[PDB]
Amino acid sequence: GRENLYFQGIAINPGMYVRKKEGKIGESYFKVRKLGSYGEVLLCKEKNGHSEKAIKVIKKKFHEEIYNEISLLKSLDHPNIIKLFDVFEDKKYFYLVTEFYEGGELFEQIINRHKFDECDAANIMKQILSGICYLHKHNIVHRDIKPENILLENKNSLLNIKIVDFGLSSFFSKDYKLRDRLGTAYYIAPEVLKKKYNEKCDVWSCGVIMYILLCGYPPFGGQNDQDIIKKVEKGKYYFDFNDWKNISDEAKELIKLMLTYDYNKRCTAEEALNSRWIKKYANNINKSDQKTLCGALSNMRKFEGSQKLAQAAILFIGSKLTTLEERKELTDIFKKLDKNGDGQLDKKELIEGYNVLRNFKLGELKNVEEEVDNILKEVDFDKNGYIEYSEFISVCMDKQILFSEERLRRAFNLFDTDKSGKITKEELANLFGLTSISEKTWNDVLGEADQNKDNMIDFDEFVSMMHKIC
Numbered sequence: 001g002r003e004n005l006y007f008q009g010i011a012i013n014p015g016m017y018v019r020k021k022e023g024k025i026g027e028s029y030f031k032v033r034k035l036g037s038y039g040e041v042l043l044c045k046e047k048n049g050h051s052e053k054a055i056k057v058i059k060k061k062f063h064e065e066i067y068n069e070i071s072l073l074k075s076l077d078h079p080n081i082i083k084l085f086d087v088f089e090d091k092k093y094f095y096l097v098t099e100f101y102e103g104g105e106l107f108e109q110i111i112n113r114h115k116f117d118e119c120d121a122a123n124i125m126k127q128i129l130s131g132i133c134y135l136h137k138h139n140i141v142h143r144d145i146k147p148e149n150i151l152l153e154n155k156n157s158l159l160n161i162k163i164v165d166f167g168l169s170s171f172f173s174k175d176y177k178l179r180d181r182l183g184t185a186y187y188i189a190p191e192v193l194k195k196k197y198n199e200k201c202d203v204w205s206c207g208v209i210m211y212i213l214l215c216g217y218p219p220f221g222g223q224n225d226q227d228i229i230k231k232v233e234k235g236k237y238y239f240d241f242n243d244w245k246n247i248s249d250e251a252k253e254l255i256k257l258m259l260t261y262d263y264n265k266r267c268t269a270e271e272a273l274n275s276r277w278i279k280k281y282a283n284n285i286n287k288s289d290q291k292t293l294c295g296a297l298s299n300m301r302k303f304e305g306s307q308k309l310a311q312a313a314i315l316f317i318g319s320k321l322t323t324l325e326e327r328k329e330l331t332d333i334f335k336k337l338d339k340n341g342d343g344q345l346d347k348k349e350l351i352e353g354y355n356v357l358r359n360f361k362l363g364e365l366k367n368v369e370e371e372v373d374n375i376l377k378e379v380d381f382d383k384n385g386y387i388e389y390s391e392f393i394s395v396c397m398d399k400q401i402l403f404s405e406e407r408l409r410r411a412f413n414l415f416d417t418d419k420s421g422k423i424t425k426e427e428l429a430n431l432f433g434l435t436s437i438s439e440k441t442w443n444d445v446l447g448e449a450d451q452n453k454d455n456m457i458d459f460d461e462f463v464s465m466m467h468k469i470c
């Protein structure tokens, strides 16, 4: 795919919409309640719009560790991974504005229901492994995968769960081994205790989770870190006959793979996702999904972002302003189209999605491969050759939902950093993280919008531009 390595033009990703806010946090949000706990996590409400956010309040050298977490979080775009919105800073604290999940921790579900049948466990595991697969492909290792760091989007529902808490996470290279001893005793991979490892430590932590879901207790037990660590180091675990006699061979086989002591021979997250057990509980597009599939793929097929200001706006609204409920059905379609569960849609996956849709509805022979190549030119905001979650939401949701006055005003205000009421060439270049943009790039924005010929874009002009795209 060397075509995606050259002559790409301006790339846009959701990380670019996270700005370090110089304003006082208390002027944008108010406290609702304390969610927990380093510092505190608070449920807060936006003074404008009254949307709810989980604000992680981190107490203040160590600013290196916080800036790394911020850079990791900024890059995350996946249905089963926490979304970061904004960052504030004051004298004693850093504030991380994240998406609030009301269903509580997976751990609490474990307390309440003791163990899960295989259907529920597989549903939980496919989501964790999808998140982890996506992390590892984006050169991120989580290092604290455990049920306390998995949250439920909705109360008592396992439909969509979220990986949170990237405080121990790191970027990783294939060319260097990781060395810091970090984790939680039940879940920590033996090679992490030996202080020499790679991303395979997360797979092991997932193998510990799966084991727990299926029987209610950890494979390397004990009641203090010291005892647990001793058992983890040794690496031996057992499927107690009475507790496991009615659990399928496939489940036990996946666990064995995920808990393979040698980390080079341990399966990848991708391989775990391709196991018989995970495949057995597959949730793919069927006739029930035809209406949302049709709306989604019809919108995608028709998508034009026009010039760079409009494209920037669209990805902003889609990636940061749409609610979990608004996204519910599209999130469900995204996951179903994502056959390999890596959290990206590839060309082979989109072709298959369109073929499945055409088969539900028989006309002229279409060249579906060429149609998808063309769709990718328009919808791939970050120019990486794949469709990520937020790109998908942004091009598949109705413009009627995205382009509310309130959302257009929010988009305008994010671009207009000096609050001058006009967006300049330089403000657009700053949004995209570039020293400057070409005269042609800005002139393409202007031609479609600048009604008063001042080489800048005001809110009225912005709104008219955006509605002309509808």
Ligand SMILES: Nc1ncnc2c1ncn2[C@@H]1O[C@H](COP(=O)(O)OP(=O)(O)NP(=O)(O)O)[C@@H](O)[C@H]1O
Binding pocket: 035, 036, 037, 038, 041, 054, 082, 098, 099, 100, 101, 102, 104, 105, 148, 149, 151, 164, 165, 166, 167
């Ligand atoms: N986005 C969120 N939505 C809902 N609750 C959250 C969210 N983020 C964190 N919490 C809760 O706040 C508490 C976290 O404190 P703790 O259990 O020590 O982990 P931590 O590493 O200190 N930070 P974290 O797990 O990210 O909050 C837990 O109850 C979390 O479930």
Ligand SMILES: [Ca+2]
Binding pocket: 003, 004, 005, 006, 007, 008
């Ligand atoms: Ca190219």
Ligand SMILES: [Ca+2]
Binding pocket: 148, 149, 165
């Ligand atoms: Ca935590």
Ligand SMILES: [Ca+2]
Binding pocket: 338, 339, 340, 341, 342, 343, 344, 345, 346, 349
């Ligand atoms: Ca995929």
Ligand SMILES: [Ca+2]
Binding pocket: 380, 381, 382, 383, 384, 385, 386, 387, 388, 391
């Ligand atoms: Ca992309």
Ligand SMILES: [Ca+2]
Binding pocket: 415, 416, 417, 418, 419, 420, 421, 422, 423, 424, 427
């Ligand atoms: Ca301005």
Ligand SMILES: [Ca+2]
Binding pocket: 449, 450, 451, 452, 453, 454, 455, 456, 457, 458, 461
């Ligand atoms: Ca103007």
Ligand SMILES: [Mg+2]
Binding pocket: 144, 165, 166, 167, 168
């Ligand atoms: Mg933590």
